[PDB]
Design a protein around this ligand. Structure first.
Ligand SMILES: Nc1ncnc2c1ncn2[C@@H]1O[C@H](COP(=O)(O)OP(=O)(O)O)[C@@H](O)[C@H]1O
Ligand SMILES: Nc1ncnc2c1ncn2[C@@H]1O[C@H](COP(=O)(O)OP(=O)(O)O)[C@@H](O)[C@H]1O
Ligand SMILES: Nc1ncnc2c1ncn2[C@@H]1O[C@H](COP(=O)(O)OP(=O)(O)O)[C@@H](O)[C@H]1O
Ligand SMILES: [Mg+2]
Ligand SMILES: [Mg+2]
Lengths: 475, 461, 475
């Protein structure tokens, strides 16, 4: 079951023979490099090469594998770094697994799902309070370069420690140094043993960048269809779409807007629809997705960004002006949203956060007219003073995720006025000192929230904060 | 391993080989010219019927159909190691400085995969330059890419030579300069400029000049990079690769794509824009053996930072060094914009907690001074608050302490150059912000190295 | 000879069977004496671009090789003559008596064959010689819309080389022939024709002649460079040359890219302009200076061909319509225009006085917003505006009236040291004309100092001599 290469260029080959080959079949070239049968023509096969192609020429031989485009799957991948074919890049030897899963696969149909109702806590105040993610949700992370997108996903993965959630970080078109940095950060936070890392680095041929997200999807699907819960990150789909454009243009498929092919929407929509929350009958498992888009100069109305916005269940927009002014994470509250909303939140957080997004959106608008200190009417003065303090609470250092119970207390404190007599510069230290106090001395209150998901008795809570306040020295 | 020329169409040559022996893609192929001399050519596409379409690295005028062409059996292969130092090469690794052959032990191929995942440094490491403005406010990182903005006459070449000098003096690393679309006149000037400052002996130079065909300008950067890879991998050095201009690499890519007949992508660029860039950029990285830091001049078409060329280049940058003529005209050298320049590794995680605090402090003071420039010019200094008058005082001292005499200007200024380590740079600016030198006159801070030299210069005034 | 036969003909292109041993770029002769050039060496034909009338060429017409790459006649016999790109006389004054020829394609001086540009090429235009100085061996682009004054800059530059021992070559690509006749007549009247060669591929000529015209002119100037003399070549314009090469490339079915230009259209201009240079002392010290032209459309300097030629040359002189119609003629945008060679191409006197002109105008251009607020402004900015309007008047300059550098230095010295601050803005240009006629008649010892030393005279003597003139000037 052999074929010979008639023509090659730019990682695409036409192959004579392979009469019995399936459409979408995995193929192996003479030198061990894999390929994919894409076009079955009348007496030749269109083959996309999934690896280095300098040693492939006219005359090189190709073997069928008799298997549809697949990736190895299961528990053997946890803690490993692999490419989109499932081959280990970390140099810790082979991936011992008997289970495989196809890269293209149908999404759960209309009857196979249940409404998203279970939290996926990122550990990031801004997100878990205002833009809550749930298990089975697709939530776009979108923003310019260097606005803090990757750090959101890394922190989210780290915060799944002990939550029994399998994580998959797919790195499409990134610098490989960055990917090495990610695995090392996960190792140090003891988050690598429940995380699979798929990587098509910037130097890899376009077809690997194209496949990388589908491979990661299948790796997470495995856990979903066994009634477990997974999280997949595609970082980023902008580079995947560019790679699929390269491929489409090399095959001379007609270009449209920004030279992308007509099916570039379909590219992302099939991928992201495979993430879902299954029904009770189908096992109750979930695959949650965090696709990334990299905008240019904050242009969210561009072709690819609008495609992915119209696919997902909400978005987290990160804005450069906020980022470089020291609001980090730099969430644009006006544009960002979670279509799932309060359904993906514990009752305590839904209570304290209820109007938080709308309150800050109004703060940010009214902040433009804030030059009139002492002259401005007392209503708007108070709103600005509350606003600057809540902004300080929602600032959050990198790789420092917060438990939900501690977030609810911190947000409760600021929204009920307990920091109104404290200097704005002291708010962040006040929070750190408050929570170490609550952990050491008032753990019965924190524990109520972890068990019931409800707020404790508001009178007990008010007292406990005012107790802390009497031992706090401002500046 | 022989072939016949079947077609010649500008810088594209179709060559027919015999059944079993077709050259691999990216292989070098030589054709002896009827007029004398060798034309090297690079295999690109396998058209079928045992034909290979190839991209010429020099003029195809004078070629005839049916000439013999020879597969060299590997990509373009180029001299590496100590024999390259002080010499000037073309894309093919042939010397063009008229100083005879290069007796190098090895020749490495210019096409090559990026370093394996296992080989990679897994933590960001600062590269100390010894230049105060850079180290403090927009530090260079060892694996990383640095984008070098600045017009005519602001100090680009002086800065690039001082980096070659200061990487060579203190860390003991070497440099490579790749002129991608170098103008021949300016290559000649840069040679003599480096010979006079003495940095030449620490630097290999590669020029793929404006008059060469697209193939040459596309691949000359790889030639330079291949030389730097040796010094990293086989002598464990922190190496500097300078590329001027990385846009012209991308532009040559689009030129060659057009001649291969490929359908254009957005804004008329080649469909392989991103991957061609990744194949260059991912080789510029820090491994466990050492580092290559790249310093790249970047043209921005139509002033549009969203244009596919700069947009794809920007994805790989760790840092920027923005040279501004306004500062040069004031006498602030190096003329690095301390607000516009940036680095991904100016963070507490990488430089210390103190470094970050100081650098942000410096930028806050400079930014405030910048805002008051208009107010001061019209309303005068009596209008400012006591807090602002103190900030303006310090800003002016800060602005001068960011200036620094260069070793490579030692001939022209007649003053000795200065290497200032990061610890000392941080300490100096910390003390100015703290108020410890509010009584030194402003001229004391201008063109000095450490804070101690400023205290010493005050006595002389 | 072996002969070949024509398979197909149309639009000035023939495809020819046979001619197996032909070189790429070889000159060919058709049966009826019309020449052609082998451009495309194809698998089963040769693409031949016809360099003359093609109505008498048909299917079956025979083609002979000549075994020769394109050459053109060269030397002193061309001075004062009008020729086409083949060196054939168009002025009807009979043959060009010369024994020397030179190839149209020729390699450029390599990196070691050159010396840094250090010798002025004085245009005679204050704006240029002071702010955008051209040097011998430099390539300086003249770029701007139609009717912005590009041709008159080059004509004035040629005229100013009278008696400077500089051979001039005006290459006219794609112009109307009446216009070219007008150019030669203007040169004749200013006694600049006897040191000037005129190459012309008029708009009616076949595309290959428009393509070759600049290379022919280049070779004609190279001859003088390689004998240790100094030449100046003008390509008016490369926009039309590139269009002609596109016509040719498209007829040969070479794949189009941006604006339908071929991939090698950059290479077309870069080869040409790199052949202009300043040679080393060892190679004879001669120079070829180049002034290529680009015609922009609606001021679009970011278009494909303009960006190519900007990135090739050593600077550019941008001309603007807004400036032209506001009375700034020559209409040089001084802020945006650039000489990368700079002070190296200037006599010490001019480098000194121009230093202050640049800083004066930079301050003027910033403060120009405040010019409708006359006498509201503080006295510092008032004076900067008054100095600015006066230096602008100095840089205005009549057409076909080049100025010696010694007279420029005095005029710029006068205005930059305040000697015109007392004089009405409307009188400045007459003040200059009257000053220089005074300096020529009465103070020639001061002017002569500059012609001999290249240095300023003693500033006290110079200040006195101007103030002497001032007392006889009536507003
Ligand atoms: N919350 C934060 N606090 C401090 N620094 C941050 C934070 N988030 C991101 N950063 C820094 O900003 C830089 C860019 O962030 P990253 O998440 O890599 O953005 P992107 O992935 O969009 O390029 C990183 O180097 C990181 O150190
Ligand atoms: N650090 C410096 N100290 C003193 N003079 C400098 C310095 N840098 C640049 N210059 C001056 O500016 C001139 C132009 O700088 P150059 O390096 O040629 O810039 P570019 O590479 O942009 O052409 C130098 O020749 C020198 O006189
Ligand atoms: N410096 C000048 N002062 C006055 N008129 C000028 C000047 N330069 C050019 N002109 C006139 O302006 C027009 C511009 O023509 P030309 O020099 O051929 O510009 P272009 O080559 O850009 O079309 C002509 O009619 C010419 O007579
Ligand atoms: Mg990222
Ligand atoms: Mg004209």
């Amino acid at each position: 079951e052999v074929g010979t290469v008639i023509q090659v260029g730019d990682g695409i080959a036409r192959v004579h023979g392979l009469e019995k080959v399936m459409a979408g079949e995995l193929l192996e070239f003479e030198n061990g490099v894999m390929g994919m049968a894409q076009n079955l023509e009348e007496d030749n096969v269109g083959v996309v090469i999934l690896g280095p192609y300098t040693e492939i020429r006219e005359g090189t031989q190709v073997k069928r594998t008799g298997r549809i485009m697949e990736v190895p799957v299961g528990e053997a991948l946890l803690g490993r770094v692999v490419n989109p074919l499932g081959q280990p890049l970390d140099g810790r030897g082979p991936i011992e697994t008997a289970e495989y899963r196809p890269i293209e696969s149908p999404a759960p149909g209309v009857m196979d799902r249940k409404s998203v109702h279970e939290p996926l806590q990122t550990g990031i105040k801004a997100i878990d309070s205002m833009i809550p993610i749930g298990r089975g949700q697709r939530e776009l992370i979108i923003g310019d370069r260097q606005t803090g997108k990757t750090t959101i996903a890394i922190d989210t993965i780290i915060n799944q420690k002990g939550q029994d959630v399998i994580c998959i970080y797919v790195a499409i078109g990134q610098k490989q140094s960055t990917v090495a940095g990610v695995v090392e950060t996960l190792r140090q936070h003891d988050a690598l043993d429940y995380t699979i890392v798929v990587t098509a680095s910037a130097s890899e041929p376009a077809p690997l960048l194209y496949l990388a997200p589908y491979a990661g999807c299948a790796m997470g699907e495995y856990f979903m269809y066994k009634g477990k819960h997974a999280l997949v990150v595609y970082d980023d789909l902008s580079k995947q779409a560019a790679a699929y454009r390269e491929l489409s243009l090399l095959l001379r498929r007609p270009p449209g807007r920004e030279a992308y092919p007509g099916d570039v929407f379909y590219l992302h929509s099939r991928l992201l629809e495979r993430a879902a929350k299954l029904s009770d009958e189908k096992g109750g498992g979930s695959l949650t997705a965090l696709p990334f888009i990299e905008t240019q100069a904050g242009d969210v109305s561009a072709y690819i960004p609008t495609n992915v916005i119209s696919i997902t269940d909400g978005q987290i927009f990160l804005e450069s002006d906020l980022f470089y002014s020291g609001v980090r994470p730099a969430v644009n509250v006006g544009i960002s949203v979670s279509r799932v909303g309060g359904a993906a939140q514990i009752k305590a957080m839904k209570k304290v956060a209820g109007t938080l997004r709308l309150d800050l959106a109004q703060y940010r608008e009214l902040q433009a007219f804030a030059q009139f200190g002492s002259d401005l009417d007392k209503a708007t003065q108070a709103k600005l003073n509350r606003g600057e303090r809540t902004v300080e609470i929602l600032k959050q250092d990198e790789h420092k995720p917060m438990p939900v119970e501690e977030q609810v207390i911190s947000i409760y404190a600021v929204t009920n006025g307990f920091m109104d007599d404290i200097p704005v510069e002291d708010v962040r230290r006040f929070e750190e000192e408050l929570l170490s106090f609550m952990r050491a001395n008032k753990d019965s209150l924190l524990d109520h929230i972890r068990q019931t998901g409800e707020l404790p008795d508001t009178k007990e809570l008010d007292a406990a904060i005012e107790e802390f306040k009497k031992g706090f020295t401002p500046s | 391993n022989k072939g016949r020329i079947i077609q010649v169409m500008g810088p594209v040559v179709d060559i027919q080989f015999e059944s079993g022996q077709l050259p691999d893609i990216y292989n070098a192929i030589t054709i002896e010219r009827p007029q004398g001399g060798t034309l090297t050519v690079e295999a690109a596409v396998h058209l079928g019927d045992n034909v290979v379409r190839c991209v010429a690295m020099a003029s195809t005028d004078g070629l005839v159909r049916g000439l013999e062409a020879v597969d060299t059996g590997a990509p373009i292969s180029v001299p590496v190691g100590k024999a390259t130092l002080g010499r000037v090469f073309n894309v093919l690794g042939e010397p063009i400085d008229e100083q005879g052959e290069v007796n190098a032990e090895e020749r490495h191929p210019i096409h090559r995969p990026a370093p394996e995942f296992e080989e990679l440094s897994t933590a960001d490491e600062i590269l100390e330059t010894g230049i105060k403005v850079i180290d403090l406010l927009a530090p260079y990182a060892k694996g990383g890419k640095i984008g070098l903005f600045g017009g005519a006459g602001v100090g680009k070449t002086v800065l690039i030579q001082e980096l070659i000098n200061n990487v060579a003096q203190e860390h003991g690393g070497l440099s490579v300069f790749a002129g991608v679309g170098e103008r021949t006149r300016e290559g000649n000037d840069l040679y003599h400029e480096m010979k006079d400052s003495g940095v030449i002996s620490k630097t290999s130079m590669v020029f793929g000049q404006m008059n060469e065909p697209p193939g040459a300008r596309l691949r000359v950067a790889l030639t330079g990079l291949t030389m730097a890879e040796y010094f990293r991998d086989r002598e464990g050095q922190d190496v500097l690769l300078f590329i001027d201009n990385i846009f012209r690499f991308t532009q040559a890519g689009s030129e060659v794509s057009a001649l291969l007949g490929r359908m254009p992508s957005a804004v008329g660029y080649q469909p392989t824009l991103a991957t061609e860039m990744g194949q260059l950029q991912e080789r510029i990285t820090s491994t466990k053996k050492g580092s290559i830091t790249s310093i790249q001049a970047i043209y921005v078409p139509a002033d549009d930072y969203t244009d596919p060329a700069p947009a794809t280049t920007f994805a790989h940058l760790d840092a920027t060094t923005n040279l501004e003529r306004k500062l040069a005209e004031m006498g602030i050298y190096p003329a690095v914009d301390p607000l516009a320049s940036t680095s991904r590794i100016l963070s507490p995680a990488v430089v210390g907690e103190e470094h970050y605090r100081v650098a942000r402090g410096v930028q806050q003071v400079l930014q405030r001074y910048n805002d008051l420039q208009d107010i001061i010019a019209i309303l005068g200094m009596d209008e400012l608050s006591d807090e602002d008058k103190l900030i303006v005082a310090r800003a002016r001292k800060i602005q001068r302490f960011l200036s620094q005499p260069f070793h490579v200007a030692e001939q022209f200024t007649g003053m000795p150059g200065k290497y200032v380590p990061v610890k000392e740079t941080v300490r100096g600016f910390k003390e100015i912000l703290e108020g410890k030198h509010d009584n030194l006159p402003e001229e004391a801070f201008y063109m000095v190295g450490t804070i101690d030299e400023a205290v010493e210069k005050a006595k002389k005034l």
